[PDB]
Amino acid sequence: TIDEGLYSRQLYVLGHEAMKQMSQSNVLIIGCKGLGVEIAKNVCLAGVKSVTLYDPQPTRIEDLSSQYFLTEDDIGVPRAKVTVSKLAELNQYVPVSVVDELSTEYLKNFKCVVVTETSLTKQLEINDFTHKNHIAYIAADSRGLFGSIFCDFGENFICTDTDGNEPLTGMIASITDDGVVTMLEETRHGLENGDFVKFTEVKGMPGLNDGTPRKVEVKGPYTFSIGSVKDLGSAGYNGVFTQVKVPTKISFKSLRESLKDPEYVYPDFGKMMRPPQYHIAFQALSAFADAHEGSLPRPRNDIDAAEFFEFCKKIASTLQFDVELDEKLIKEISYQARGDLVAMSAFLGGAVAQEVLKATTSKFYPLKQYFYFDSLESLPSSVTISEETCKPRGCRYDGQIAVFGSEFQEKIASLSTFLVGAGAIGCEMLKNWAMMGVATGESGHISVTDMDSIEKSNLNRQFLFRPRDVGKLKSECASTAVSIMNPSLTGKITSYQERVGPESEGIFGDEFFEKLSLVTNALDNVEARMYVDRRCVFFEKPLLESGTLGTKGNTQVVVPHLTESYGSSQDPPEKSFPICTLKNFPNRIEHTIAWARDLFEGLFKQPIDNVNMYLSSPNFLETSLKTSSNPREVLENIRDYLVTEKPLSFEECIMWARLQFDKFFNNNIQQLLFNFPKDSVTSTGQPFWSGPKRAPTPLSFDIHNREHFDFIVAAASLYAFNYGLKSETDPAIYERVLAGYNPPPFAPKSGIANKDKQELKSIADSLPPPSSLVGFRLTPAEFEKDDDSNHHIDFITAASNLRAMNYDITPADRFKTKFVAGKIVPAMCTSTAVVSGLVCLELVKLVDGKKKIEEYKNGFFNLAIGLFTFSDPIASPKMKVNGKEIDKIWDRYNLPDCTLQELIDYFQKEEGLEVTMLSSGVSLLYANFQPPKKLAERLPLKISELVEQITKKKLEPFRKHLVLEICCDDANGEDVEVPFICIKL
Amino acid sequence: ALKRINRELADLGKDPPSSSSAGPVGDDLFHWQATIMGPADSPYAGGVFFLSIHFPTDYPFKPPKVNFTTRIYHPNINSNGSICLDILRDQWSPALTISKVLLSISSLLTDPNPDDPLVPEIAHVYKTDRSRYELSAREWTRKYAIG
Ligand SMILES: Nc1ncnc2c1ncn2[C@@H]1O[C@H](COP(=O)(O)OP(=O)(O)OP(=O)(O)O)[C@@H](O)[C@H]1O
Numbered sequence A: 001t002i003d004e005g006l007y008s009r010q011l012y013v014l015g016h017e018a019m020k021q022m023s024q025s026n027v028l029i030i031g032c033k034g035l036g037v038e039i040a041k042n043v044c045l046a047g048v049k050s051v052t053l054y055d056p057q058p059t060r061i062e063d064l065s066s067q068y069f070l071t072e073d074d075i076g077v078p079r080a081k082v083t084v085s086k087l088a089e090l091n092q093y094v095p096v097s098v099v100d101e102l103s104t105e106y107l108k109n110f111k112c113v114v115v116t117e118t119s120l121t122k123q124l125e126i127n128d129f130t131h132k133n134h135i136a137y138i139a140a141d142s143r144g145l146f147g148s149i150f151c152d153f154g155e156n157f158i159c160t161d162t163d164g165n166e167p168l169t170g171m172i173a174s175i176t177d178d179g180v181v182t183m184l185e186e187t188r189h190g191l192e193n194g195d196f197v198k199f200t201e202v203k204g205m206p207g208l209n210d211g212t213p214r215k216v217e218v219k220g221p222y223t224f225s226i227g228s229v230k231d232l233g234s235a236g237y238n239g240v241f242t243q244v245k246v247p248t249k250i251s252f253k254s255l256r257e258s259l260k261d262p263e264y265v266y267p268d269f270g271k272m273m274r275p276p277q278y279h280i281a282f283q284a285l286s287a288f289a290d291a292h293e294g295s296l297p298r299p300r301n302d303i304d305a306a307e308f309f310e311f312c313k314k315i316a317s318t319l320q321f322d323v324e325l326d327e328k329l330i331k332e333i334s335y336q337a338r339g340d341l342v343a344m345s346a347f348l349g350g351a352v353a354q355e356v357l358k359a360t361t362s363k364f365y366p367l368k369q370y371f372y373f374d375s376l377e378s379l380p381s382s383v384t385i386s387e388e389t390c391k392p393r394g395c396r397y398d399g400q401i402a403v404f405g406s407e408f409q410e411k412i413a414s415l416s417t418f419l420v421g422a423g424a425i426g427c428e429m430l431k432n433w434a435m436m437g438v439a440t441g442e443s444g445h446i447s448v449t450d451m452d453s454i455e456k457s458n459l460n461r462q463f464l465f466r467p468r469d470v471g472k473l474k475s476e477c478a479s480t481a482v483s484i485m486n487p488s489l490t491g492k493i494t495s496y497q498e499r500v501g502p503e504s505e506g507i508f509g510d511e512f513f514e515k516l517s518l519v520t521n522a523l524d525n526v527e528a529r530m531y532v533d534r535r536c537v538f539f540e541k542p543l544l545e546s547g548t549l550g551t552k553g554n555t556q557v558v559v560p561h562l563t564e565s566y567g568s569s570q571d572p573p574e575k576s577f578p579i580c581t582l583k584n585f586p587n588r589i590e591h592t593i594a595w596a597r598d599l600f601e602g603l604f605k606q607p608i609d610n611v612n613m614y615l616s617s618p619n620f621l622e623t624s625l626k627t628s629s630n631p632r633e634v635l636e637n638i639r640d641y642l643v644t645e646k647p648l649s650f651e652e653c654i655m656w657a658r659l660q661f662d663k664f665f666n667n668n669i670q671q672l673l674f675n676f677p678k679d680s681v682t683s684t685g686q687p688f689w690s691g692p693k694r695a696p697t698p699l700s701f702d703i704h705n706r707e708h709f710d711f712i713v714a715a716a717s718l719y720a721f722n723y724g725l726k727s728e729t730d731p732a733i734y735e736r737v738l739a740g741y742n743p744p745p746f747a748p749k750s751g752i753a754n755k756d757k758q759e760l761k762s763i764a765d766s767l768p769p770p771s772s773l774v775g776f777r778l779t780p781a782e783f784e785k786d787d788d789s790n791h792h793i794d795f796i797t798a799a800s801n802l803r804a805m806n807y808d809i810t811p812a813d814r815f816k817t818k819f820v821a822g823k824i825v826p827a828m829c830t831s832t833a834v835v836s837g838l839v840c841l842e843l844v845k846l847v848d849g850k851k852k853i854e855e856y857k858n859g860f861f862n863l864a865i866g867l868f869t870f871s872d873p874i875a876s877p878k879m880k881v882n883g884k885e886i887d888k889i890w891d892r893y894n895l896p897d898c899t900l901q902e903l904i905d906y907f908q909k910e911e912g913l914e915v916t917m918l919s920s921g922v923s924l925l926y927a928n929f930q931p932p933k934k935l936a937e938r939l940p941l942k943i944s945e946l947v948e949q950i951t952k953k954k955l956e957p958f959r960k961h962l963v964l965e966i967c968c969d970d971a972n973g974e975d976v977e978v979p980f981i982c983i984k985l
Numbered sequence B: 001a002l003k004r005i006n007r008e009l010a011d012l013g014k015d016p017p018s019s020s021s022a023g024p025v026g027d028d029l030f031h032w033q034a035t036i037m038g039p040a041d042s043p044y045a046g047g048v049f050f051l052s053i054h055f056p057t058d059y060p061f062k063p064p065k066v067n068f069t070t071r072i073y074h075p076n077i078n079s080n081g082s083i084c085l086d087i088l089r090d091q092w093s094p095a096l097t098i099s100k101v102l103l104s105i106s107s108l109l110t111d112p113n114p115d116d117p118l119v120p121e122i123a124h125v126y127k128t129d130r131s132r133y134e135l136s137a138r139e140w141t142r143k144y145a146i147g
């Protein structure tokens, strides 16, 4: 009963069973500050059964530093009572409640218990109960730029999936008598030692087809070992192996037991001596709060730091921790005890929400057990951070002023950022900017652009949008929502509806891009990322890239003249199957899905486009007869869709669908088996239909069968949609119409001048003239995966499964068909929160203008295994030009709009280089090998005039520069790379 | 991108391909028209075949789109000009030059691969009735590939 219209992207990460088990779990959340509200939001968007909140503390002003469901009108009201109403709107399937008082036995009502903003004594009291009653217990804490997570799921936690990866499967070439299983040519199984596999469709060793998992002993990248198969047989030929995943038993320890001997998780390997320090420091914080009526150390206060360090010494002595305490780091923890940052809150909230989902669904490998994190590299160094600057000012930014100071707050308030995209990461980034106070000053401004509209499936991870906002523009809704969150951003946010690309340079030009301070990408495709990266490189602006894929995520920072750009890195490209594999010899469901998509496009889209273009373009036939690859195909499509096979009623559509069934699933297979019989052999004597080639078999139309009827219904409905007829769904009419069908005879044909032009002319003159058909247009079918009533995925699924039945491939359901055909990217709210937190932690480094490259950190993480890693950015490569140091990426030549000859002379005389190629955009302006007449005609023209002449397009009035790529040779003839040229028009 | 394309173009200019001639269309660096001469020891002897090469924006990180323009009677080449070359679909790596692609296509024309065909009828004719395949190939290369 999962609402797949809303959880579409999340089901591809978790699954149906995981979400079914998740929708029966109760979560209690103690503490409703920024971290607690982030956890509650992520849990509500995830889809647990219910959420209960407990926070009777009255609201204060500083709480607004990271609580985005609190307004200044709520001062003096308990935080839970004012957060429940706003949390109840995120998801309609997840009720949210509030408890005035919490008793121990009450905890038995819940499946998971999350604890924040609670003293250590109360945490021990809660955990002593939630441990022996088998209740998952997560405790999270956030102090300044430091964070801690602790997980305790019981002594007998069962983890079904330990990495989140799909089970490994592959094809076998041969299995020897000693269990040595070999993969096909250039195919790597990818198995690791200790895995279990099950074999199917094995020839010569039927015993391995029983299904019993067997051990794996990897022997190489292509072969492995399974043990002894002597009894079953001597040798096995071909077959498919599939990995088997076995549940694991994980044993946790209680908080009281794990205080003395903790088990750490290291988010970074460059600093592995710190977690032992943080373990003492946080306990000392709890003791200090207990000894001062719950008052944490004052910001940048030396007396409190000294007392806190004395508490740390006492704790380290009591626990017999044989670790020397780092005074500077501990005192730093003391200074930022009252800090409350939205970036740290978002990061830890995403992590803790993922831990909650692990506890409820018994999936993925959890943290075990202590996770201590810090981003101390973000602390500003170009401003004064002392007791005087960090004291609270009685404003909503107190939690951030207590870490960064008032001067850095004024630096933040004057930012002029540019956010590209308004998806999930865009919404999180806008929330973080609103909470941090970005662009709330006189000179601040925010610009957000996105050309898409809100859909139902987007509401599962984009929390700024509501079901009443479905169908509206993302940028406007996001700007309005974040102006609601922070009233000071009224009039400081501008929302566009423009796609960032070559066509939008009239809006995002020099004037727009020269006032910015940084650019943040929230895109989902590589082309736009590359374009924005090139624009930032040209204008020399800092860039923040961030990406997610299911539970994986990464963040990268590009700094002018310091690090390399985004395009300097290469990612694994997409895999496209060979045309010969798709056309005739498929062996996986992906091949059949691709074939079905091509069939859909070629049946309902291309012929309609040709018909429409014929009835509109007056001279279309002449152009097609000498331009299109197959003019005969175009003419046949036009004839068939205009006169020959034009339906007058839906019954004719049904008959057409039956005919297409015969055409594509019964006759082409007969032709293929006539060309290559099942008993044919290759040139080397081996049987043809062996290995990656599976012998097909024609399908006979059986109306009672489900797949045949589904294909008929989908095809007839789509044809009627093309011709604008009235579709129906009652099986009675289909069974009545298809009963009286006589299949036309078909026999495969063995084969055995300028008359073809005569036949083409005869076909052409048979077509109706455009004048006789005025206003008659056929509606094409534009692929749309997200609508379930257009019969698109239904048709693709039916065709794919029928072709699988042809080749005895295992058919897939509509869920997997929609995942594969639609190129859906799995997405989660927790990953979005984590990447937004990391990006906003890098943003404060960018604001402070840090110069050293070791102070920035590109981040990568995988939440399925609890892996976090941070690495320094790659420095921009240097080069030697004319005995001078030149940055490859961030250097350019500035020249006037001089003639081509003057440009060549300047390069010859100044740089001592001989120009051999000069191009602009995609055009070759000048080449050393061109005939002399062309050069003599082109040399004395200005660069702008030359570009206008060659590109056959006048320069737009808003064009103010030209980017030229130049390749030149040295005096000796050796090639030398040089930066691009920036001609100033 | 542009620099690599121009380097390949200059290399073709510096060293003649003899059996091929590739160059940009008009003044566009991302659209080339190449010419291939039929091998002497093949039915396509004395023929000129025109190929259209479309360089993707992500070149050389994505394969160029090479499509025949002249009609050819070959088991691995269909009626739309698509070529069954492994180095152009998923084996592509940013280390292959256009001269290598043209040499591979010439070798493909030298001897087809009927065990993994793209046009099953032509492959069947080639495997069973060789003389008819030769006659059809000569007829096609005389009707389309000449003049
Ligand atoms: N070139 C571009 N210029 C501006 N905005 C862009 C560009 N390309 C993509 N976007 C926007 O980036 C955002 C990407 O967010 P996201 O991928 O989460 O949403 P979606 O693609 O609509 O959803 P889904 O992928 O889940 O179906 C979308 O708003 C999309 O409109």
Ligand SMILES: [Mg+2]
Pocket (backbone or CB within 6 Å): A452, A453, A455
């Ligand atoms: Mg969308």
Ligand SMILES: [Mg+2]
Pocket (backbone or CB within 6 Å): A524, A825
């Ligand atoms: Mg998307």
